[PDB]
Amino acid sequence: TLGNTTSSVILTNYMDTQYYGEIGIGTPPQTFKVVFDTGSSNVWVPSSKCSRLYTACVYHKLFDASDSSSYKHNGTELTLRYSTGTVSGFLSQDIITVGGITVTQMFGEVTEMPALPFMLAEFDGVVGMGFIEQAIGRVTPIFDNIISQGVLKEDVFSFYYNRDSENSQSLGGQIVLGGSDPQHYEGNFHYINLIKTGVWQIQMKGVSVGSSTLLCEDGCLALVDTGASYISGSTSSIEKLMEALGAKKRLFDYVVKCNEGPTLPDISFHLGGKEYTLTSADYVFQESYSSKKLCTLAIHAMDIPPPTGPTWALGATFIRKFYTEFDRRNNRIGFALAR
Ligand SMILES: CC(C)[C@]1(C)CC(=O)N(Cc2cccc(C(=O)NCc3ccccc3)c2)C(=N)N1
Ligand SMILES: *[C@@H]1O[C@H](CO)[C@@H](O)[C@H](O)[C@H]1NC(C)=O
């Protein structure tokens, strides 16, 4: 069922690596900073029942069911094993407010929150924008529940991720539920169908580094991940890519001498009928131009395990350049040049 509602949530851009917006849980609402994540399908926030020996719980907002009159107990154990770490807790139900839409939602109350990486998190929790097929504990995802209300103009949601400005007047980003915002893209959308329903993953035809270097020559996969900071490939693909850039591997990232940064070649991703090109300005964190300083790249290696992986992941690095529309009705992803 389709209505006429379009609901927009303003996002905060933290250092070009974390984009989060606000949701309200319970009666009266308890507010949380959440990542709207196409690479996961569960809603979770830290719990009041999280042992304060998990220091990430001391530094985050915690959900207290004892202060909510609309809370409905569940208690089923929940373990969410992600690429960056694991969170664990139990299932709870309450009313969630997201941009003006109110939905009764089953979510995870996290009681085990590792300091690595969650002490680096500016957000409190996660809003999974993925399909029910990838939902842990077969919990109905928030977007499915919003669709059931039949209030949205379209069975779509869109993401705009801005470049990190130090100006407060700068909008960090924006998620539109039910449509797209023409104020944040130009030209037209070019759609690529999903390999299969259940994953925000498409076929990638090839990856070009300048003129001479070529990767994904026989085709590969691309997961379009709003909850990933960087563009990611397999360890092997990233080794060849970084060799072509003249980048040096560190513990968790890849760097170049800052002065060399503006000289790096364009990287192009062949998706559907179009080539999606990122210049060095798009993937280099140009913090300086010093020959005496190292500059990080917004590209890393991430070996995603099956059935989803092996796959590339197009994270915030990609979405900043290309406004993205996630189309549930048609099982496709649309890209347009962001503005
Ligand atoms: C948000 C995140 C914790 C999680 C739930 C779990 C996870 O491993 N990924 C992939 C993944 C891979 C590599 C890095 C990161 C990262 O640094 N994300 C931070 C972030 C937060 C908000 C927006 C963009 C990026 C995430 C997700 N898609 N969702
Ligand atoms: C938790 O929710 C699921 C939803 O299908 C339900 O089947 C289960 O019985 C619930 N558990 C409890 C103890 O309420």
From Swiss-Prot:
Domain Peptidase A1: 19-336
Enzyme class: hydrolase
EC number of this enzyme: 3.4.23.15
Catalytic activity line of the entry: Cleavage of Leu-|-Xaa bond in angiotensinogen to generate angiotensin I
Gene Ontology BP terms: amyloid-beta metabolic process; angiotensin maturation; cell maturation; cellular response to xenobiotic stimulus; drinking behavior; hormone-mediated signaling pathway; juxtaglomerular apparatus development; kidney development
Keywords, alphabetical: Aspartyl protease, Cleavage on pair of basic residues, Disease variant, Disulfide bond, Glycoprotein, Hydrolase, Membrane, Protease, Secreted, Signal, Zymogen
Annotated disulfide bonds: C50-C57, C216-C220, C258-C295
Disease: Renal tubular dysgenesis: Autosomal recessive severe disorder of renal tubular development characterized by persistent fetal anuria and perinatal death, probably due to pulmonary hypoplasia from early-onset oligohydramnios (the Potter phenotype).
UniProt similarity note: Belongs to the peptidase A1 family.
Protein name: Renin
The organism of origin for this protein: Homo sapiens
Gene: REN
